[PDB]
Structure formats: structure tokens, C-alpha cells
Write a protein that binds this ligand. Structure first.
Ligand SMILES: COC[C@H]1OC(=O)c2coc3c2[C@@]1(C)C1=C(C3=O)[C@@H]2CCC(=O)[C@@]2(C)C[C@H]1OC(C)=O
Lengths: 1032, 247
């Protein structure tokens, strides 16, 4: 992260022209002149447009009609890009190979629409990966309303940025990178053991770039203002000066300086105590001295160009019955399909299956008659559902398919919201383009899939007729639902006794039985309990955390109950953001429920925690029925309030743009974000350019007949990176892994294709910060193209959260959740952890003898060297600690097929754990090598005191995660929406429900885990024989 | 005997295992299972397309759903509601326990790899290997196809631009072809007409380039529908092994 986790113990595919990856060093380009003539010009592929134009108008003077030509500078180029648009190139600084041309030609025009600026925000098109204006004629009114109505959010955010001109704009661009709690866990505080810290403060002095420093000893809970104050007091000592002048000096210059971390773009712009900053806390951890740079506010403030937010171009009583006046049962007419793709091998026939759903389904679903020659898909029949129309819940939808199962003795699906984004009940003729069935699915219906017609019209297409009543039918207002709830609550007490389970309101003391708030989100609830809960819904307002369970007890196909639920929800006590997130997954489609959830977030989510769970909150946007909702408003606003949040909001959305079921929703969102983010769009565009070159590069190496010997691929790589277009694109941009890291110039000698199977790119940038190398780092990232990196990403998130829980319980286990970002369809970046080696790489090195002779003690021997006596104890403790952590996380998560190339160790003793891939099965390690490092002694190390302490950390850590099962269940639950093979349904999450006991006692669990562990089996492979193939 | 070997007592099985057994099954389908915290037992009944978990409470050697526990053997309880409607326990459940699952379907297996076997377990691998193959080829084609479609769109815009170029040079040439014939200046008219015949010829080239792409696309579209046709032939056979194979 900051320091490479190094403890100091002593303290649609792309590519350059259509059909071609790489355009030849020289090419002919046709120029369509404005005087009507076409002239072909010989160009270098890296030629800038400025020089191409200059050449064009030089050589045009040799062709007919030269006199009808205006000056060189009167025109601009225009061409077709391989995204099929007419792009105008205003930035004539751009190189030929960079314009994403479809064909080698340009057209010469006079700048029409003469709003150079609005057109120039074509920068949005590029960042998004889609031409803005594909939006401009979509026609769907929901879309066009979203574009208009979401601009309010932009306006508010942009205003809330100039509320206090210079400082609030700094806060947005450089937000405090701070923990959620000021209070400091015992083991971290104790590393101070006075309650105070030694910090070094650096100043860059008169142009000589000379660097004076000041060592201060300060209370860990000092605000940045007070560290600066202590820095003034130090400097001012030397000048003598009277007190009172001393006192006037501090008082009037404290707020005139600013603190920066040395070697990355992080600032201390807020009055949080020093040790609440992640960097300071990390310094304490690592046994490092905080290095801060002192800097005038004016110098930071002067270099924050910002201002321009402009409202874009798109800124311009009927017959209505209420839903609950319609006196009929719901029916839907199934007309006909255009076609389905089956031969007729055996006419197992086609039929449309339909269901009315709330994720869980308000009724028994029905098929039409197997009326089919497959030749003609035609039914023309009304299907009758057993649900009264007034009973239809707001988030009601129709989920249908055409399929097959077989009789002893699939095909195409689609979902439709029964209501609009305007609360209109659907009526009339309706055509629906169907979706191809997901790989691992055979369920006849797919209600967890997206809503609305397939964008691709070259697909099976079902025609439906919805009932038309006298007029437009609308869902009733809250200001009528409320009235109905109060009425039916008044009916309750007039009843005599009742003999039906959903009975009552006294209330007995046996209601200790409502300590089922304690039960996990997938514990599941008997019908008795569903009826019990609903009967006592009024006493629940005193145990707020049962809300999700109560919500699963409600009969959503009952207007009487649902109205009452809205009432309870309306003034429900707030719940911790962790629990509110549960309410945004697929089990809770109702907008009232979700509105409550978003309100918890707006109140109790720190920016820290939002950052932590952003991956989940982005995914959860897919379960929302409508484009405009309170969750996009919330996220988008935070994204535009906090650039750190904004950065990953961008990449998480961008990384899924290839996915057609989500393109429009995410593109629309990205469009509004990009339009309002300010100057970061420029930095984002630089990041997207970089990534596109890398993608194109590793595409050539992956297919384009490049599968020759590693050395050959290296020749190609070295040639391409030296080319000016590549130099320009891949130097001087922010790291998508962490935007606080500037990536300067490439170190070409250190850049390599790794000689693994997957052969990823290892890239190395300089750190262009003044106080970098000599105080911080140089910068290494893997570019992976080919493997889905989402699983790694999720795993690394969970590890970071696990570590958090332990570390805040005073259980000091160190994990290494290195950076990992999926940036597109199987494209991603991985942080390189410096000074680390795989167990295998250690075993292979000499082992203070030579060659490839190891044995089980080699790991320990390697660590004993490197941490020569006295620092040694630390190394062993760090190893023991980290080892414990991964031993438990691995087991809980079911990360199997570990081995000596999967596990790395650092020079300081820290262990982890790379290259995850597989999830919950789809286990328990402890190698003898590790056993020997814990302890030190010979074959006897399963009965040492060190081993017992180790087992204790494992027990304590297992139980901690167990206590926070719920977070993890919900985190995995929210992630069910994406296309992860290991997370298609709730039954996949069941794995951790078993790994952590859950349906047992804490006491039975501990025992279960103990058992898993005291088995374990140990040993390891060691020169003896077959450490290569593993024979015996 | 008694409870331990009734058709509908599965005991051992988990929550997931039941859901697969009750998929798309008619109202009245049920099984009894061990509870996850071992009353001791769970009834899982199908109604309205859902799977209802009903507890069986075992207090003092008597069974039931709620505190007037009339029954005393579980088999006594379950058989009661085979004949009687469940409406006398909560009116909304008017259904009867009509259809047992039966732990007799098609050989005492799962007790002792290829050893404890073997014929159409291996057939699965083959059909499953082919399903993989086809689904891959299927998604590649799909995306291939999309690329061509945006390429056709790119060609349309290209041609449109080149068509405009003639409409450009006939605006500018027409009032110069007649200005040069004033000077009796031909051959200059020849150079102007040389460009015209390069541009006209170029349009034919692009137009053909698209048309060639078009007949490749509809050929691929045909190929795609074929992959799908073959896939929908293997789906309802790959499942019909799982049914014969596992149980
Ligand atoms: C087993 O394949 C290790 C290696 O090669 C890969 O193809 C691969 C599959 O995802 C990863 C990797 C690599 C690239 C592997 C990273 C990683 O997680 C590690 C994550 C943390 C780290 O420092 C990385 C970058 C080191 C690196 O291995 C070395 C240099 O030994």
C-alpha cells in the first residue's frame, strides 16, 4: 500500500484500425478535401494530426481547385471511428494510430455547430467506452427522463463543492484517508506506550530543492493544525523571539500550512486526530516513522484548476383509475413468438411459461397449452392468475419463458415490470425480445435476471396483450395506502379472539423467542415463525434489527398486510448500515423497504465504509426496478462529493460496460458522473488511454500469431514500448489501483512478460514525487488480460474486512489484501508486493548450502537469515500472526488447492496468499514448513508452547468472524447479481454457513473447528524425492 | 421401522436438497426431514409455488405444529393430514398432504472414484464436455456477430461520407467545367474528371466491401441459430442422465 507492507522490526474488442491490431509503420490515408477532391497522403502511423494537416495543405496545392481552399487553420478533420460514429477531432495533438479509425481516411470540414466545448466533452464518450448520442435517440422516455432528472444531483454536488471555495474543493479532490473510529485498540496504542509518536516533517527550501527536516514528538491524537503548530514552535526557537510574539506567530500561521504524506498524493486537510489517518496508523503498525511534508496552503490551492459545470443540451391530467378499484383477477394474453431455435428432432413442443413475481412470487404460475408445431409459435390465449389485481404489490413483475423439461412415463426468457417508473399498470399490446439462457441454468424461469426487452432485435420475440380497463391504471399514493392501513388496524380489535395464526395485536414474556434477530440472514423461517412475527409486528419496533425477518413474513400478495408494513417501515427506528445493506439485495424488491435502507446509509455510512463496500453497492444497483431511484442518487452524490469514492465508482461501472444487460443503466450513470466530476475526467481519460494500449498490446501477444518462444515475445514488447505513441500513453498518469499514486516514466529494463502459463505483464513506473524513492517507493503492477479477476477482488475485499474485525477486537493478525482491480471483460491490474517470494522460490534457493537442496527447515532457516538475532523474535511473531490469519480465512472461504507457489513470505516474516481464482469449494492446510517456523525446534512442534498460542489465535479469530457472520452472508448475498460462476444462487453461500457452524452453538462450533484443525495433516515436500511431480 | 423408513422421511438431507426435489411440483407435495437444530423434525410442503417449512414440535413424547399437541408418533401426525385438510391448522393452508417424495425412486449406493461403480456416468462427461464446447463457440460467435453489425454500421457512415464527396465535387466542378470551356481549356477538365473516376470507383469498392461483410454476417447468423439448435438438443438429455445417474 504505502510501504510495500515492509515491517521495520528495529524500531466488443478494440485495436487500431478495423480488422487490424497494429497499423503498419507507413500507411496511405485518403483525405476528402472540402473543394470536393480526394488526395492520398503517405503518413507515418505516429503522425500527429497537426503535421498531417500541414502536409495535406502543402500537397493540395498540386491538385485541381486549390484556390477554393481556405487557410490550413480554417478546418478540422472528421472521420468514422470503429464505433461507427462521425468524430470531429479538435485535439490535433492526437496521433494517427490513436484516433480509433475504422478506415485510413480523413474528411476536411469547417467547424460547424461552432460550440467547440459541448462537442469537446466527447471526452465523456471516450471515458465511458460508448458514444454519448447513442443516448440522444433512444426513444424510451424512462431513459430520456433519467438523463434530465439526475442533473439535479450533479448541481447539488457541484454547489456543495464551491460552498467555501478553496478548501471544500481541496477536500473533494484530496479527501482525508481516515479510519472510521478515533479510538485506538490496545495493541496499537501500546506500540506508543506514552500515548505519543515521533514524526518527521519535511520542507523543500529555496529553489535548491534542498530538504530540511524536523523531528517532533507529539500526542498521537493531535490534529494536523497542532503538528504544524509544533513545527512552528521548533523553527521559531532558533530565532529566539519574545513569548507573545511566539504566541502570536503560532496563532496566525497554523492555518496557513498544510500536511502531505511524502511520496504520494495524500493530504491531512481535516481536523481528525493524527492517528485516525490510515497512513499514521499504518506507520505505527509497520514500526515506521511518519514522514510528512509541510507545504503552504496557497501552493496546493493555487494548483486546483476547477469551475466548469454546464447544464447539457438535453435540458428542455388524463383518465387515471386507481389500481385498487379494478375489480377483476389478473390475466395476461400470450399471442405468439417470431421463432425459437430448435430443429424438431423430437417435438417436445414449445409453450410459454409465466409467473407473477416479487423475487419470491405472489402466486402459482402457469403455462399455456403445449399448442405447438414449433414451426408456428402461436397460442393467442389469455392466461388466468389467481391474484386479485388490487393485491398486486408495487414491485410486482411478470417473468416468462419458452422452454422444455421432458416427461418420463430453457430456450429463451424475459421479465417485465407490471408497473412503470411512473406507477402505471401496464396495458395493451406489448412486444418483448427474449434473452439467451444463462450457462449454468435450467429453471424454466429466471426471475433474478434483468427486466425489459433485449436490445438485440435479432432474437426470439414474444407478443403479449395486457388488459385495458376504461383508462390509465395507477398505483395508489402513500397518502391513501396509509388511510387503508389505519382502517384495517381498527378492524383488528373488533374481532373476537380469532383462530388464525396471523392473529393478535398484553404480550407474554416467552417473547424471548424473538431473539431470532440473532439468526443469520439465511437461517430461514418456519411458517409458524412467519405467523408469529407478523402477529407481534408492533412489539418489533422495539427490536429494530428483526426488520428483514419480519419483511420475509409479510404476505406481499396481500394489500391489507402490505399497507400496514409500509406504515411500520415509515417510522421504523434506524438500523446499522451493515444491516441496511441486506435490505438492498434481491430478497427485498419493494421500494419502500429500499428507501428505508438508503436512508440508513445517508445517515450512518462513513465515506471509509462506503469505500469498503462500494463493490457490493454498485452490484446492488442492478436489482433496482427503475433507472431513477434513491440508491443511484445516493451513490452518485457521494461519488461527486469524494473523488476517491468517485474513482472506484467509475472503474466498477466501467468494468461491466461490455455486458449488454447492464450497458445502458451503467452508461447512463457514467454519463452523468463524467459530466459533473470536473477535472478528474481528464485524469480518467489518461487512465483509459493507457489501459487501451495495454489491452491492444497483450491481445497481439495472446492471439495475433504470437505464441513463439518467450524471448521472441520480449523482442516485440521492447520494440512497441519504445514507440512514441506508447511512451506518451503509458507515462504520466494516475494508478487505477490507487489514484494517489502518480505513475511517472516507465523503467523499460524492469518491464517483462512473466514466463508463467498465463504470461501476464509486469510493469514498472518511477514515482515522480519529489520525496519518493528516498522516502517511499518505486511502482510495480501486473497487467492481466485473459483471466476473470473479480473473484480475486472479492476475496481480497473479504480478507481486508476480516483483518478489520480482528484488529478492532485487539486480535492482532496481519493480512495482506494487495490491490486488485477488474477494469473490463477479463482485464485487470494486480499490485506487486515487493521483497517477497513464494515458499517454492525460497526452497529452491541454496538454503545456506547450495543448488536445490531444501528440507522442511529451509523456510525457517531463510527467515533466520534476513532477521539475524534480536529482530528475530518479531519475525517469528509476524509469521505466526499472518499465518494464523490466512489459515482461518482460507478455511472459512473454502479457498482450496493451495501450495508452495500460492503462498509467499516477505523478508520480515509476513505470509500471504496470492492468486485466488476459486471460491467456496467450486479443506485445511498447515504445512510442516510453517509448523517449523512457528516454534523453531525439530520434528517436535505440534506440542510446543508456541503451537498452542498459535492455535489460540486461530480459535479466537474463527469465533470473531463467526460473530460477524451476517456481514459476510450479506456481502456475498449482494454479489449474486454479477456473473460470477461461484455465486449464481443462495445455495452457493451455504458453504460459509457450514464452515462457520451457524446452525450450532458457539460451543459446538469451536469444537467443530478444533476438530478440523487437529486433523489437518502436515508434512511437506523436501528434496528426498519428487518435490516436482509429487509421486509416492 | 415406523418413521425411519416411511417414503416421505428423508431425514439426512439439507435445505438445498429439498428445493431441487420440489421444483415445479404440484401443490400438496411434501417431505419430512431432520431439523437443522436437533422440535426435531421439519415438514416441507408445496403451496402456491412456494416451499413451506413447518416445524414439528416434540414436547414430552407428543407431536404437532402448535401447543395442543394431539399426536404422538409423527407418522400419526403426517398420516392425519394425508386424509384431513391442513385447514384446521391455519385456514389459509386449505391444501392436503397429497404427494410424498418417496425415498424409493430407482440400489443402495453412497456408502463405500471409478471403483464404487460406470457406463453412463462417463456419458455425462462426454455430453457435458460437448455442452462446454458448444456454449463457448456459441458466445464467441455471438460476439463475433455483434462486431460485424457495428462494422456494417461503420461502412454505412463511410459510404454516406463518400457519397457526399461527389455531391461536393459536382457543386464545385460544374461551375468550373463551364468556366474552363470558356478558356477552351480541356485536359484540365481531364484532371478534374480523373479525380471523379477515382472517387466513383472508390465508392464501388467500399460498397462491395460491405456487401461481402453482409453475406458473411447472415451466414454467421445461420451458424449461430444452429449452435443454439444443437445446444437445446443436449440440455434435456444432460438432465435426463442426472435423473437416471445419481438417483
Ligand atoms: C502463481 O502465479 C504467480 C504470478 O503469475 C500469474 O500469472 C498470476 C496469476 O495472479 C497473480 C499472479 C502472479 C503475477 C503473482 C501475483 C498474483 O496474484 C501476486 C499477487 C501479489 C504479488 O506480489 C504478485 C503480483 C506476485 C506474482 O507472482 C510472483 C512474482 O512470484
Amino acid at each position: 500500500s504505502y510501504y510495500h507492507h515492509h515491517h521495520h522490526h528495529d524500531y466488443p474488442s478494440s485495436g487500431e484500425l478495423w480488422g487490424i491490431h497494429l497499423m503498419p509503420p507507413r500507411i496511405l490515408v485518403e483525405c476528402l478535401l472540402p473543394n470536393g477532391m480526394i488526395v492520398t497522403l503517405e503518413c507515418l502511423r505516429e503522425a500527429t494530426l497537426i503535421t498531417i494537416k500541414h502536409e495535406l495543405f502543402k500537397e493540395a496545392r498540386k491538385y485541381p481547385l486549390h484556390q477554393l481552399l481556405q487557410d490550413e487553420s480554417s478546418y478540422i478533420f472528421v472521420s468514422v471511428t470503429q464505433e461507427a460514429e462521425r468524430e470531429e477531432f479538435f485535439d490535433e495533438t492526437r496521433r494517427l494510430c490513436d484516433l480509433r479509425l475504422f478506415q485510413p481516411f480523413l474528411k476536411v470540414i469547417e467547424p460547424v455547430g461552432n460550440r467547440e466545448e459541448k462537442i469537446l466533452n466527447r471526452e465523456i464518450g471516450f471515458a465511458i467506452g460508448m458514444p454519448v448520442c447513442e443516448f440522444d435517440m433512444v426513444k424510451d422516455p424512462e431513459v430520456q427522463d433519467f438523463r434530465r432528472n439526475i442533473l439535479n444531483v450533479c448541481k447539488e454536488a457541484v454547489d456543495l463543492r464551491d460552498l467555501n471555495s478553496p478548501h471544500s474543493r481541496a477536500m473533494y479532490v484530496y479527501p482525508p484517508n481516515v479510519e472510521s473510529s478515533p479510538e485506538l485498540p490496545k495493541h496499537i496504542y501500546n506500540k506508543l506506550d506514552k500515548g505519543q509518536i515521533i514524526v518527521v516533517i519535511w520542507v523543500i527550501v529555496s529553489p535548491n530543492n534542498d530538504k530540511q527536516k524536523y523531528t517532533l514528538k507529539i500526542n498521537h491524537d493531535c490534529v494536523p493544525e497542532q503538528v504544524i503548530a509544533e513545527a512552528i514552535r521548533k523553527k521559531t526557537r532558533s530565532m529566539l523571539l519574545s513569548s507573545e510574539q511566539l504566541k502570536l506567530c503560532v496563532l496566525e500561521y497554523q492555518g496557513k500550512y498544510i500536511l502531505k504524506v511524502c511520496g504520494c498524493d495524500e493530504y491531512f486537510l481535516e481536523k481528525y486526530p493524527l492517528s485516525q489517518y490510515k497512513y499514521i496508523r499504518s506507520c505505527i503498525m509497520l514500526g515506521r516513522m511518519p514522514n510528512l511534508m509541510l507545504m503552504a496552503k496557497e501552493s496546493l490551492y493555487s494548483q486546483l484548476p476547477m469551475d466548469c459545470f454546464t447544464m447539457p443540451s438535453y435540458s428542455r391530467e388524463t383518465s387515471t383509475k386507481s389500481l385498487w378499484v379494478i375489480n377483476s383477477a389478473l390475466r395476461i394474453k400470450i399471442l405468439c413468438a417470431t421463432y425459437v431455435n430448435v430443429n424438431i428432432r423430437d417435438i417436445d413442443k414449445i409453450y410459454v411459461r409465466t409467473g407473477i413475481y416479487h423475487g419470491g412470487e405472489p402466486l402459482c404460475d402457469n403455462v399455456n397449452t403445449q399448442r405447438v408445431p414449433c414451426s408456428n409459435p402461436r397460442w393467442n390465449e389469455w392466461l388466468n392468475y389467481d391474484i386479485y389485481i388490487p393485491d398486486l404489490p408495487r414491485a410486482a413483475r411478470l417473468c416468462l419463458s419458452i422452454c422444455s423439461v421432458k416427461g418420463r412415463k430453457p430456450l429463451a426468457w424475459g421479465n417485465i415490470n407490471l408497473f412503470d417508473y411512473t406507477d402505471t399498470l401496464v396495458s395493451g399490446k406489448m412486444a418483448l425480445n427474449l434473452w439467451p439462457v444463462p450457462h449454468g441454468l435450467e429453471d424454466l424461469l429466471n426471475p433474478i435476471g434483468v427486466t425489459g426487452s433485449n436490445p438485440n432485435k435479432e432474437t426470439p420475440c414474444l407478443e403479449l396483450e395486457f388488459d385495458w380497463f376504461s383508462s390509465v391504471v395507477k398505483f395508489p399514493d402513500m397518502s391513501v395506502i396509509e388511510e387503508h392501513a389505519n382502517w384495517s388496524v381498527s378492524r383488528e380489535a373488533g374481532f373476537s379472539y380469532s383462530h388464525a395464526g396471523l392473529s393478535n395485536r398484553r404480550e407474554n414474556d416467552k417473547e424471548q423467542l424473538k431473539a431470532i434477530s440473532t439468526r443469520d440472514p439465511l437461517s430461514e423461517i418456519t411458517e409458524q415463525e412467519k405467523d408469529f412475527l407478523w402477529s407481534h409486528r408492533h412489539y418489533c419496533v422495539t427490536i429494530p434489527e428483526i426488520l428483514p425477518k419480519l419483511l420475509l413474513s409479510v404476505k406481499w400478495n396481500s394489500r391489507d398486510e402490505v399497507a400496514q408494513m409500509y406504515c411500520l417501515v415509515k417510522d421504523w427506528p434506524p438500523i446499522k448500515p451493515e444491516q441496511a445493506m441486506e435490505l438492498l439485495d434481491c430478497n427485498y424488491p419493494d421500494p419502500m423497504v429500499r428507501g428505508f435502507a438508503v436512508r440508513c446509509l445517508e445517515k450512518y455510512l462513513t465515506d471509509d465504509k462506503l469505500s469498503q463496500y462500494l463493490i457490493q453497492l454498485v452490484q446492488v444497483l442492478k436489482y433496482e426496478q427503475y433507472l431513477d431511484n434513491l440508491l443511484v442518487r445516493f451513490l452518485l452524490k457521494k461519488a461527486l462529493t469524494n473523488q476517491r469514492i468517485g474513482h472506484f465508482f467509475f472503474w466498477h461501472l466501467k468494468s461491466e460496460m461490455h455486458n449488454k444487460t447492464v450497458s445502458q443503466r451503467f452508461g447512463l450513470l457514467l454519463e452523468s458522473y463524467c459530466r459533473a466530476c470536473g477535472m478528474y475526467l481528464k485524469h480518467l481519460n489518461r487512465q483509459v488511454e493507457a489501459m487501451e494500449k495495454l489491452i491492444n498490446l497483450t491481445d497481439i501477444l495472446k492471439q495475433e500469431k504470437k505464441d513463439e518462444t518467450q524471448k521472441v515475445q520480449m523482442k516485440f514488447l521492447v520494440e512497441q514500448m519504445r514507440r512514441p505513441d506508447f511512451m506518451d500513453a503509458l507515462q504520466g498518469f494516475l494508478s487505477p489501483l490507487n489514484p494517489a499514486h502518480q505513475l511517472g516514466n516507465l523503467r523499460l529494463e524492469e518491464c517483462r512478460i512473466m514466463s508463467s502459463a498465463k504470461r501476464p505483464l509486469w510493469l514498472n513506473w518511477e514515482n515522480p514525487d519529489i520525496m519518493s524513492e528516498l522516502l517511499f517507493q518505486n511502482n510495480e503492477i501486473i497487467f492481466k488480460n485473459g483471466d476473470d479477476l473479480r473473484q480475486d477482488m472479492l476475496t481480497l475485499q473479504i480478507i481486508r474486512i476480516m483483518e478489520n474485525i480482528w484488529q478492532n477486537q485487539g486480535l492482532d493478525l496481519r493480512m495482506l489484501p494487495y490491490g486488485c482491480l477488474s477494469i473490463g471483460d477479463c482485464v485487470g491490474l494486480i499490485e506487486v508486493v515487493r521483497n517477497s517470494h513464494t515458499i517454492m522460490q525460497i526452497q529452491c534457493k541454496g538454503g545456506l548450502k547450495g543448488a536445490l537442496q531444501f528440507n522442511s527447515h529451509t523456510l525457517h532457516q531463510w527467515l533466520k537469515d534476513k532477521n539475524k538475532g534480536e529482530i528475530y523474535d518479531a519475525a517469528i511473531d509476524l509469521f505466526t500472526r499472518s499465518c494464523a490469519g490466512y489459515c482461518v480465512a482460507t478455511f472459512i472461504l473454502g479457498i482450496g488447492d493451495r501450495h508452495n507457489s500460492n503462498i509467499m513470505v516477505k523478508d520480515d516474516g509476513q505470509l500471504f496468499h496470492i492468486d485466488f481464482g476459486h471460491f467456496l469449494d467450486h479443506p485445511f492446510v498447515l504445512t510442516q514448513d510453517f509448523l517449523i517456523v512457528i516454534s523453531k525446534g525439530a520434528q517436535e512442534c505440534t506440542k510446543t508452547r508456541e503451537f498452542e498460542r498459535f492455535q489460540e489465535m486461530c480459535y479466537k479469530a474463527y469465533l470473531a468472524i463467526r460473530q460477524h457472520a451476517n456481514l459476510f452472508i450479506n456481502l456475498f448475498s449482494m454479489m449474486l447479481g454479477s456473473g460470477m460462476p461461484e455465486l449464481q444462487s443462495f445455495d452457493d453461500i451455504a458453504y460459509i454457513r457450514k464452515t462457520l457452524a451457524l446452525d450450532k452453538t458457539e460451543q459446538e462450533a469451536l469444537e467443530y473447528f478444533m476438530k478440523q484443525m487437529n486433523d489437518a495433516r502436515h508434512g511437506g515436500w523436501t528434496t528426498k524425492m519428487d518435490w516436482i511431480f509429487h509421486t509416492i | 421401522m415406523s418413521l425411519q423408513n416411511a417414503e416421505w422421511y428423508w431425514g439426512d438431507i439439507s435445505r438445498e436438497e429439498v428445493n431441487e426435489k420440489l421444483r415445479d411440483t404440484a401443490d400438496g407435495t411434501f417431505l419430512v426431514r431432520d431439523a437443522s437444530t436437533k422440535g426435531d423434525y421439519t415438514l416441507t410442503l408445496r403451496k402456491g409455488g412456494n416451499n413451506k417449512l413447518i416445524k414439528i414440535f416434540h414436547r414430552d413424547g407428543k407431536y404437532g405444529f402448535s401447543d395442543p399437541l394431539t399426536f404422538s408418533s409423527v407418522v400419526e401426525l403426517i398420516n392425519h393430514y394425508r386424509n384431513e385438510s391442513l385447514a384446521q391448522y391455519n385456514p389459509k393452508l386449505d391444501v392436503k398432504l397429497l404427494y410424498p417424495v418417496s425415498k424409493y425412486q430407482q440400489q443402495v449406493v453412497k456408502e463405500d472414484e471409478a471403483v464404487g461403480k460406470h457406463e453412463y456416468n462417463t456419458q455425462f462427461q462426454e455430453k457435458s464436455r460437448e455442452y462446454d464446447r458448444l456454449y463457448e463457440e456459441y458466445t464467441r460467435t455471438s460476439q463475433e456477430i455483434q462486431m460485424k453489425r457495428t462494422a456494417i454500421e461503420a461502412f454505412n457512415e463511410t459510404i454516406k461520407i463518400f457519397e457526399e464527396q461527389c455531391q461536393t465535387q459536382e457543386r464545385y466542378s460544374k461551375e468550373y467545367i463551364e468556366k474552363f470551356k470558356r478558356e477552351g481549356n480541356e485536359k484540365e477538365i481531364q484532371r478534374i474528371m480523373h479525380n471523379y473516376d477515382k472517387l466513383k470507383s472508390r465508392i464501388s469498392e467500399i460498397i462491395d466491401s460491405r456487401r461481402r461483410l453482409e453475406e458473411d454476417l447472415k451466414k454467421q447468423a445461420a451458424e449461430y441459430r444452429e449452435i443454439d439448435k444443437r445446444m437445446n438438443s443436449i440440455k434435456p438429455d444432460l438432465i435426463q442422465l442426472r435423473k437416471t445417474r445419481d438417483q
